[PDB]
Scaffold this active site. Structure first.
Site, PDB file in Angstrom:
ATOM      1  N   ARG A 128       0.861  -1.198   0.000  1.00 56.44           N
ATOM      2  CA  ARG A 128       0.000   0.000   0.000  1.00 56.44           C
ATOM      3  C   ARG A 128       0.899   1.251   0.000  1.00 56.44           C
ATOM      4  O   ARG A 128       2.106   1.152   0.212  1.00 56.44           O
ATOM      5  CB  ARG A 128      -0.903   0.021   1.247  1.00 56.44           C
ATOM      6  CG  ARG A 128      -2.232  -0.752   1.215  1.00 56.44           C
ATOM      7  CD  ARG A 128      -3.253  -0.161   2.188  1.00 56.44           C
ATOM      8  NE  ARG A 128      -3.511   1.259   1.958  1.00 56.44           N
ATOM      9  CZ  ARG A 128      -4.211   2.099   2.740  1.00 56.44           C
ATOM     10  NH1 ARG A 128      -4.792   1.685   3.874  1.00 56.44           N
ATOM     11  NH2 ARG A 128      -4.363   3.380   2.345  1.00 56.44           N
ATOM     12  N   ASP A 154      -2.652  -1.304   8.468  1.00 57.74           N
ATOM     13  CA  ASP A 154      -1.761  -0.292   9.073  1.00 57.74           C
ATOM     14  C   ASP A 154      -1.112  -0.861  10.329  1.00 57.74           C
ATOM     15  O   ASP A 154      -1.530  -1.892  10.840  1.00 57.74           O
ATOM     16  CB  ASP A 154      -2.568   0.979   9.442  1.00 57.74           C
ATOM     17  CG  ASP A 154      -2.979   1.743   8.201  1.00 57.74           C
ATOM     18  OD1 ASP A 154      -2.115   1.864   7.287  1.00 57.74           O
ATOM     19  OD2 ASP A 154      -4.119   2.203   8.150  1.00 57.74           O
ATOM     20  N   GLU A 178      -3.677  14.280   5.703  1.00 60.96           N
ATOM     21  CA  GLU A 178      -2.635  13.964   4.737  1.00 60.96           C
ATOM     22  C   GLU A 178      -2.654  14.984   3.641  1.00 60.96           C
ATOM     23  O   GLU A 178      -3.726  15.262   3.054  1.00 60.96           O
ATOM     24  CB  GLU A 178      -2.872  12.572   4.142  1.00 60.96           C
ATOM     25  CG  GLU A 178      -2.775  11.426   5.176  1.00 60.96           C
ATOM     26  CD  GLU A 178      -3.367  10.185   4.611  1.00 60.96           C
ATOM     27  OE1 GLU A 178      -4.375  10.357   3.873  1.00 60.96           O
ATOM     28  OE2 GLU A 178      -2.811   9.067   4.872  1.00 60.96           O
ATOM     29  N   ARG A 188      -6.425  16.167   2.688  1.00 60.70           N
ATOM     30  CA  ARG A 188      -7.544  15.409   3.193  1.00 60.70           C
ATOM     31  C   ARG A 188      -8.002  16.035   4.498  1.00 60.70           C
ATOM     32  O   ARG A 188      -7.177  16.600   5.224  1.00 60.70           O
ATOM     33  CB  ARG A 188      -7.013  13.978   3.477  1.00 60.70           C
ATOM     34  CG  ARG A 188      -7.979  13.007   4.109  1.00 60.70           C
ATOM     35  CD  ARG A 188      -7.372  11.589   4.164  1.00 60.70           C
ATOM     36  NE  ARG A 188      -8.124  10.635   4.916  1.00 60.70           N
ATOM     37  CZ  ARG A 188      -7.803   9.350   5.061  1.00 60.70           C
ATOM     38  NH1 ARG A 188      -6.700   8.869   4.499  1.00 60.70           N
ATOM     39  NH2 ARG A 188      -8.560   8.555   5.801  1.00 60.70           N
ATOM     40  N   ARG A 229     -14.210   4.451  -1.866  1.00 58.80           N
ATOM     41  CA  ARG A 229     -13.022   4.863  -2.562  1.00 58.80           C
ATOM     42  C   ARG A 229     -13.055   4.291  -3.987  1.00 58.80           C
ATOM     43  O   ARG A 229     -12.688   3.109  -4.257  1.00 58.80           O
ATOM     44  CB  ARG A 229     -11.791   4.371  -1.779  1.00 58.80           C
ATOM     45  CG  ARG A 229     -11.505   5.217  -0.540  1.00 58.80           C
ATOM     46  CD  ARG A 229     -10.278   4.806   0.242  1.00 58.80           C
ATOM     47  NE  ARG A 229      -9.982   5.767   1.300  1.00 58.80           N
ATOM     48  CZ  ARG A 229      -9.057   5.611   2.245  1.00 58.80           C
ATOM     49  NH1 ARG A 229      -8.310   4.492   2.303  1.00 58.80           N
ATOM     50  NH2 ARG A 229      -8.868   6.588   3.135  1.00 58.80           N
ATOM     51  N   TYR A 272      -5.291   5.508  -2.559  1.00 55.36           N
ATOM     52  CA  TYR A 272      -4.145   6.378  -2.520  1.00 55.36           C
ATOM     53  C   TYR A 272      -3.393   6.328  -3.865  1.00 55.36           C
ATOM     54  O   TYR A 272      -3.448   5.317  -4.594  1.00 55.36           O
ATOM     55  CB  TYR A 272      -3.159   5.936  -1.413  1.00 55.36           C
ATOM     56  CG  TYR A 272      -3.537   6.285   0.016  1.00 55.36           C
ATOM     57  CD1 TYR A 272      -4.831   6.237   0.432  1.00 55.36           C
ATOM     58  CD2 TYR A 272      -2.534   6.542   1.005  1.00 55.36           C
ATOM     59  CE1 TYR A 272      -5.148   6.524   1.765  1.00 55.36           C
ATOM     60  CE2 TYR A 272      -2.856   6.835   2.324  1.00 55.36           C
ATOM     61  CZ  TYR A 272      -4.167   6.839   2.671  1.00 55.36           C
ATOM     62  OH  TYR A 272      -4.544   7.110   3.913  1.00 55.36           O
TER      63      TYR A 272
HETATM   64  C1  LIG Z   1      -2.937   7.870  11.211  1.00 58.67           C
HETATM   65  C2  LIG Z   1      -4.386   7.789  11.494  1.00 58.67           C
HETATM   66  C3  LIG Z   1      -5.201   7.191  10.341  1.00 58.67           C
HETATM   67  C4  LIG Z   1      -6.392   6.629  11.132  1.00 58.67           C
HETATM   68  C5  LIG Z   1      -7.570   6.227  10.279  1.00 58.67           C
HETATM   69  O1  LIG Z   1      -4.603   6.160   9.525  1.00 58.67           O
HETATM   70  C6  LIG Z   1      -4.155   6.455   8.211  1.00 58.67           C
HETATM   71  C7  LIG Z   1      -5.255   6.140   7.262  1.00 58.67           C
HETATM   72  C8  LIG Z   1      -5.091   5.521   6.099  1.00 58.67           C
HETATM   73  C9  LIG Z   1      -6.244   5.269   5.237  1.00 58.67           C
HETATM   74  O2  LIG Z   1      -7.218   6.063   5.259  1.00 58.67           O
HETATM   75  O3  LIG Z   1      -6.194   4.286   4.432  1.00 58.67           O
HETATM   76  C10 LIG Z   1      -3.748   5.000   5.653  1.00 58.67           C
HETATM   77  C11 LIG Z   1      -2.585   5.512   6.454  1.00 58.67           C
HETATM   78  N1  LIG Z   1      -1.483   4.576   6.222  1.00 58.67           N
HETATM   79  C12 LIG Z   1      -2.957   5.552   7.933  1.00 58.67           C
HETATM   80  N2  LIG Z   1      -1.851   6.035   8.714  1.00 58.67           N
HETATM   81  C13 LIG Z   1      -1.172   5.360   9.659  1.00 58.67           C
HETATM   82  C14 LIG Z   1      -0.027   6.114  10.275  1.00 58.67           C
HETATM   83  O4  LIG Z   1      -1.438   4.218   9.987  1.00 58.67           O
END
Ligand SMILES: CCC(CC)O[C@@H]1C=C(C(=O)O)C[C@H](N)[C@H]1NC(C)=O
Ligand SMILES: [Ca+2]
Length: 489
Positions: free
Chosen positions: A23, A48, A325, A341, A403, A443
């Site tokens: 990912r 994650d 992000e 975002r 998505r 993403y």
């Molecule tokens: C960091 C908080 C957030 C909580 C939903 O997660 C993000 C969401 C993500 C997502 O929406 O797919 C992917 C990111 N890789 C993730 N970040 C971390 C550090 O794990």
């Protein structure tokens, strides 16, 4: 796959990373015209952190047509790197590796003035992710200087009486005296010059049970590991390494989050790429986007000395910790526009006119539909005018449920005839549909390839849904010429 889909994955199940899953794409054309990429090698399904994740990396030296075998420039060895099918049944799908350290969410950035490439990733101690990270910087001050703090095994819980000081020498801070222990450049532990060791873990399913069990394989005992005599504070860290040979070799591990605010839970990267300013007084400033559960949500780190020192900036006062992000583009005079975002059901925009030190209030972007949780986006500059105007490109899904429905947009920059942050406007004239509207799209990362074509690495499924977890070979690479993209639907 069609003919057009040949070569449409860089990372895949069976490659040199030994991961079945990936990912979080990162794609970046270098000034040399070499093209590079990075992504998470998610060994334990697509979860994650907490999990077992290493950062994978790969290079193309023919303008992004062809890709070499991947490397793992940021990797932990506490748990083995292996190909394993993660269960996708209703119970098993939820199960994550509980005791591994992880690198997650990469960002790539080049300094053209030195020709140095930086690879950043979030750095998670064993069994840690954003959601169970502890509040604090992970560093202590001793006589004013910041040192990584450490918990000795036989000290009381929450007690960090030790620190990593010069030469990697570990000091007892209550007496201020060097111990017989140290870390090397990998943050591996040593006693009286001897490498300290611990047993690697393997992981295996029995039914829907995940059994994480020691093997007899010895590895270096690292302060980020579950079974270490000295252990870092269980918060999120920022890690970096640089290369001066386009990814053939990497420098020593840098833990760069010395600036993590003490009140923050997590502070992590907005994945994708960073930016080097091309125009204005601050041409050559390096900037990388961050976000946090802290005093602030959106933040940045920037460097005015080619990556040696980094300054942290807060871009707001939000304490909510939403998933802010972001990715950044530059205006013709050197001012910055950041798209991000939010947790608010829209993509937001903010501006800086002092090269990323200060940022304007969030302005919603109404052109694009999104969910309330949001998705990461990619935004980049394009080096050639478009309809005679300076151009940027944006990639993101376009839907309110799920998505899906990925687009690539072209935004044309105009002077509005106003002063500050209002100097320019963006006309989102063109909107290219990557696939059928119901096809998953999460993403993504755009880059401009040396021949002026647009490269794209993206998640071709819905990476949020609990029903599309643990898919293989969903990280897709496509190339487009700019005329293909000039679609008005
Ligand atoms: C960091 C908080 C957030 C909580 C939903 O997660 C993000 C969401 C993500 C997502 O929406 O797919 C992917 C990111 N890789 C993730 N970040 C971390 C550090 O794990
Ligand atoms: Ca400069």
């Amino acid at each position: 796959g069609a003919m057009a889909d040949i070569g449409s994955n860089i990372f895949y199940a069976g490659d040199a990373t030994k991961s079945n899953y990936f990912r979080i794409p990162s794609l970046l054309a270098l000034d040399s015209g070499t093209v590079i990429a990075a992504a998470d090698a998610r060994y334990g399904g697509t979860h994650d952190a907490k999990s077992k994740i290493n950062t994978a990396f790969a290079k193309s030296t023919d303008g992004g047509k062809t890709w070499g075998q991947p490397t793992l420039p940021l990797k932990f060895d506490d748990y083995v790197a292996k190909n394993i099918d993660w269960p996708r049944d209703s119970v098993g799908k939820n199960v994550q590796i509980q005791g591994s350290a992880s690198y997650i969410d990469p960002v790539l950035l080049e300094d053209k003035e030195t020709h140095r490439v930086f690879l950043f990733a979030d750095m998670m101690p064993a069994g840690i992710g954003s959601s169970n990270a502890s509040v604090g910087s992970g560093f202590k001050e001793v006589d004013g200087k910041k040192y990584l703090k450490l918990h000795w095994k036989d000290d009381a819980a929450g007690t960090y009486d030790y620190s990593v000081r010069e030469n990697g020498t570990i000091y007892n801070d209550t007496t201020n005296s060097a111990t017989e222990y140290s870390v090397d450049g990998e943050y591996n532990l040593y006693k009286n010059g001897n490498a300290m060791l611990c047993k690697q873990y393997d992981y295996n399913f029995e039914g829907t049970k995940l059994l994480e069990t020691q093997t007899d394989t010895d590895v270096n005992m690292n302060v980020f590991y579950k079974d270490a005599d000295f252990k870092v504070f269980p918060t999120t860290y920022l890690a970096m390494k640089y290369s001066d040979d386009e990814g053939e070799t990497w420098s020593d591990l840098q833990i760069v989050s010395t600036f993590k605010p003490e009140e923050s839970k997590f502070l992590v990267l907005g994945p994708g790429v960073g930016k080097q300013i091309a125009n204005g007084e601050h041409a050559g400033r390096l900037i990388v986007p961050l976000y946090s559960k802290s005093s602030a949500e959106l933040g940045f780190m920037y460097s005015d000395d080619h990556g040696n020192n980094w300054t942290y900036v807060e871009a707001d006062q939000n304490t909510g910790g939403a998933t802010a992000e972001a990715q950044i583009v530059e205006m013709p005079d050197g001012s910055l526009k950041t798209y991000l975002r939010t947790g608010s059901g829209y993509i937001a925009q903010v501006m800086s006119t002092d090269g990323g030190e200060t940022w304007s209030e969030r302005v919603p972007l109404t052109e694009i539909a999104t969910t309330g949780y949001g998705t990461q986006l990619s935004v980049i500059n394009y080096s050639q005018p478009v309809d005679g105007k300076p151009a940027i490109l944006l990639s993101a899904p376009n839907a309110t449920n799920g998505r899906k429905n990925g687009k690539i947009w072209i935004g044309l920059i105009s002077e509005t005839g106003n002063s500050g942050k209002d100097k320019y406007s963006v006309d989102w004239k063109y909107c290219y549909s990557v696939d059928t509207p119901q096809m998953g799209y999460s993403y993504s990362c755009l880059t401009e390839l040396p021949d002026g074509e647009i490269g794209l690495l993206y998640e071709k499924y819905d990476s949020w849904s609990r029903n599309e977890l643990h898919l293989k070979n969903i990280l897709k690479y496509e190339r487009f010429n700019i005329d293909e993209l000039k679609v008005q639907p």
